[PDB]
């Protein structure tokens, strides 16, 4: 199946964040700048022209750590003790509850790694819009559940913490303001 | 090994139910039969196999400091033929540029 | 257990797991951490059955001081947890963690030295840090292959 | 050698604080490279307090002396304070070469 990349689902999922757009498609891209170019879209590296990017390795880790997490809310019955950003999701559902949360949950891995895989060898410019724009959907289709109500709130908190995670995640790599370098408790930093 | 289909990453075997049960630390399973029933493997003649001489083997034409032989080549006719003695046991492999090989290899 | 130590100016001593320095510089995914090693993941082979054997039991082998990032996929953690473990000045853990400028000035910090002293030869920039990976595959690799004799 | 791999960037704490500004102030941070590194022939005084001339190895040999070579470097050291507030003041100043 034909893939396209589509511009709109970076400009919802930026607006269900109110981050700026430019944040979105800045993940992997935000070392060397401050966040405030970043998201003013200031100083923005052009697409990746070889399959040897850093950029497509960091867009498809952080695809990856949505991936994972969402995995681990979708089997939270096989956990003894849950993972802490899936357990306080956890701790008012009973165990019949957490096993249906198995089937409720639609999954949304689809065919990321073949494609990722396909366009970074022949597209990688494509294989950073196509991760971004994934990583987009899979939070759209994850907000954008009505059935059953009890896990609506579930499954949209989980998706908003992910992804305010992934882009914090892809903040602390980010240029640093101005602060006390003495935080570190020593006479001197390097 | 076995690779989650969800994260990309390896998988424990855990043989419980009297088959694979592949556990992945995301939670997934995936059961998977017949194909994964190998859990140990150990080749105990490695540094003499095939594959460890088949890149020397197919550049021992074109290698000057190869030792070379008085014998015809069935194959293009020269007079001359690269020797080589590979392993412990001393095999003899006459190979040629033109890509025959002493039966051998 | 198969662990890299970069000894250097700037730290010394210090056994990683080898994943753990392909998470750091965005490959995750352990499929295309060992891919770097057997170059074919889809290869029946015998070297590389060899070799993803002892890759896969090697990303499993429990580490006692990178114990809490072993499982961790999220890069910026483990650049957090290394900066921690390798920086001098930083003898406070909790303190500099409330402010988010100390968090991303360690993690800058943490990505220059990375670029600057693992694999020099191959590049000291922020755009070689894929091909780093290749090399060290493949040094895994050689390894391996001198491993099997 | 000098002029790519000895550069030098480090914070250090403020350790006064008996003035307004000194306890605003907490770390100063100390930047400088060098620029120009030239290494001469080996000379030698002989009046003690005249001017250098020429040192032969011959006389070196004998009298002990060292077969060196002065080195002149040039640096620019860039000074940054750092206070409480995310303000910074920079006092840049030229290191005229010397031995
Ligand atoms: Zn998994
Ligand atoms: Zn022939």
Same mark, same amino acid.
């Given at each position: 199946?034909?893939?396209?990349?589509?511009?709109?689902?970076?400009?919802?999922?930026?607006?269900?964040?109110? =981050?700026?757009?430019?944040?979105?498609?800045?993940?992997?891209?935000?070392?060397?700048?401050?966040?405030?170019?970043?998201?003013?879209?200031?100083?923005?590296?052009?697409?990746?022209?070889?399959?040897?990017?850093?950029?497509?390795?960091?867009?498809?880790?952080?695809?990856?750590?949505?991936?994972?997490?969402?995995?681990?809310?979708?089997?939270?019955?096989?956990?003894?003790?849950?993972? =802490?950003?899936?357990?306080?999701?956890?701790?008012?559902?009973?165990?019949?509850?957490?096993?249906?949360?198995?089937?409720?949950?639609?999954?949304?891995?689809?065919?990321?790694?073949?494609?990722?895989?396909?366009?970074?060898?022949?597209?990688?410019?494509?294989?950073?819009?196509?991760?971004?724009?994934?990583?987009? =959907?899979?939070?759209?289709?994850?907000?954008?559940?009505?059935?059953?109500?009890?896990?609506?709130?579930?499954?949209?908190?989980?998706?908003?913490?992910?992804?305010?995670?992934?882009?914090?995640?892809?903040?602390?790599?980010?240029?640093?303001?101005?602060?006390?370098?003495?935080?570190?408790?020593?006479?001197?930093?390097? | 090994?076995?690779?989650?289909?969800?994260?990309?990453?390896?998988?424990?075997?855990?043989?419980?139910?009297?088959?694979?049960?592949?556990?992945?630390?995301?939670?997934?399973?995936?059961?998977?039969?017949?194909?994964?029933?190998?859990?140990?493997?150990?080749?105990?003649?490695?540094?003499?196999?095939?594959?460890?001489?088949?890149?020397?083997?197919?550049?021992?034409?074109?290698?000057?400091?190869?030792?070379?032989?008085?014998?015809?080549?069935?194959?293009?006719?020269?007079?001359?033929?690269?020797?080589?003695?590979?392993?412990?046991?001393?095999?003899?492999?006459?190979?040629?540029?033109?890509?025959?090989?002493?039966?051998?290899? | 257990?198969?662990?890299?130590?970069?000894?250097? !100016?700037?730290?010394?001593?210090?056994? $990683?797991?080898?994943?753990?320095?392909?998470?750091?510089?965005?490959?995750?995914?352990?499929?295309? $951490?060992?891919?770097?090693?057997?170059?074919?993941?889809?290869?029946?082979?015998?070297?590389?059955?060899?070799?993803?054997? $002892?890759?896969?039991?090697?990303?499993?082998?429990?580490?006692?001081?990178?114990?809490?990032?072993?499982?961790?996929?999220?890069?910026?953690?483990?650049?957090?947890?290394?900066?921690?473990?390798?920086?001098?000045?930083?003898?406070?853990?909790?303190?500099?963690?409330?402010?988010?400028?100390?968090?991303?000035?360690?993690?800058?910090?943490?990505? !220059?030295?990375?670029?600057?002293?693992?694999?020099?030869?191959?590049?000291?920039?922020?755009? !070689?840090?894929?091909?780093?990976?290749?090399?060290?595959?493949?040094? $895994?690799?050689?390894?391996?292959?001198?491993?099997?004799? | 050698?000098?002029?790519?791999?000895?550069?030098?960037?480090?914070?250090?704490?403020?350790?006064?604080?008996?003035?307004?500004?000194?306890?605003?102030?907490?770390?100063?941070?100390?930047?400088?490279?060098?620029?120009?590194?030239?290494?001469?022939?080996?000379?030698?005084?002989?009046?003690?307090?005249?001017?250098?001339?020429?040192?032969?190895?011959?006389?070196?040999?004998?009298?002990?002396?060292?077969?060196?070579?002065?080195?002149?470097?040039?640096?620019?050291?860039?000074?940054?304070?750092?206070?409480?507030?995310?303000?910074?003041?920079?006092?840049?100043?030229?290191?005229?070469?010397?031995?």
């Amino acid at each position: 199946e034909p893939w396209t990349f589509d511009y709109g689902k970076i400009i919802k999922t930026a607006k269900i964040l109110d =981050i700026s757009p430019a944040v979105i498609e800045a993940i992997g891209a935000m070392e060397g700048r401050s966040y405030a170019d970043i998201r003013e879209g200031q100083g923005a590296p052009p697409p990746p022209t070889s399959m040897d990017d850093p950029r497509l390795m960091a867009v498809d880790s952080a695809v990856r750590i949505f991936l994972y997490n969402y995995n681990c809310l979708r089997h939270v019955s096989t956990f003894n003790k849950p993972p =802490i950003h899936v357990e306080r999701l956890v701790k008012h559902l009973s165990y019949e509850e957490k096993e249906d949360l198995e089937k409720v949950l639609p999954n949304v891995v689809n065919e990321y790694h073949t494609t990722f895989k396909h366009l970074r060898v022949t597209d990688p410019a494509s294989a950073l819009l196509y991760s971004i724009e994934f990583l987009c =959907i899979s939070f759209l289709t994850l907000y954008e559940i009505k059935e059953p109500s009890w896990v609506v709130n579930i499954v949209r908190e989980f998706a908003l913490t992910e992804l305010n995670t992934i882009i914090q995640s892809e903040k602390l790599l980010s240029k640093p303001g101005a602060f006390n370098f003495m935080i570190f408790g020593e006479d001197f930093v390097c | 090994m076995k690779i989650c289909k969800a994260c990309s990453s390896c998988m424990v075997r855990t043989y419980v139910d009297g088959n694979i049960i592949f556990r992945c630390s995301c939670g997934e399973s995936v059961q998977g039969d017949s194909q994964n029933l190998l859990v140990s493997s150990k080749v105990y003649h490695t540094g003499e196999m095939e594959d460890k001489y088949k890149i020397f083997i197919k550049n021992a034409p074109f290698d000057p400091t190869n030792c070379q032989i008085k014998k015809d080549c069935p194959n293009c006719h020269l007079d001359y033929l690269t020797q080589i003695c590979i392993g412990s046991q001393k095999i003899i492999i006459l190979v040629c540029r033109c890509g025959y090989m002493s039966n051998r290899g | 257990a198969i662990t890299i130590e970069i000894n250097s !100016t700037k730290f010394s001593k210090l056994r $990683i797991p080898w994943y753990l320095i392909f998470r750091m510089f965005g490959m995750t995914g352990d499929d295309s $951490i060992i891919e770097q090693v057997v170059f074919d993941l889809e290869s029946n082979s015998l070297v590389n059955t060899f070799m993803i054997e $002892i890759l896969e039991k090697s990303i499993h082998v429990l580490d006692p001081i990178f114990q809490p990032v072993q499982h961790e996929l999220n890069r910026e953690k483990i650049i957090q947890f290394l900066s921690e473990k390798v920086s001098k000045f930083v003898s406070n853990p909790s303190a500099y963690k409330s402010d988010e400028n100390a968090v991303q000035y360690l993690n800058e910090r943490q990505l !220059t030295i990375l670029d600057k002293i693992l694999l020099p030869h191959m590049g000291q920039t922020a755009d !070689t840090r894929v091909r780093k990976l290749r090399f060290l595959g493949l040094l $895994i690799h050689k390894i391996l292959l001198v491993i099997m004799n | 050698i000098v002029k790519q791999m000895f550069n030098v960037d480090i914070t250090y704490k403020d350790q006064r604080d008996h003035t307004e500004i000194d306890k605003l102030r907490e770390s100063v941070q100390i930047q400088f490279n060098f620029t120009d590194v030239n290494i001469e022939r080996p000379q030698h005084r002989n009046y003690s307090q005249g001017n250098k001339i020429n040192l032969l190895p011959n006389k070196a040999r004998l009298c002990g002396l060292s077969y060196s070579g002065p080195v002149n470097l040039a640096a620019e050291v860039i000074l940054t304070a750092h206070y409480s507030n995310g303000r910074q003041e920079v006092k840049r100043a030229s290191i005229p070469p010397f031995q």
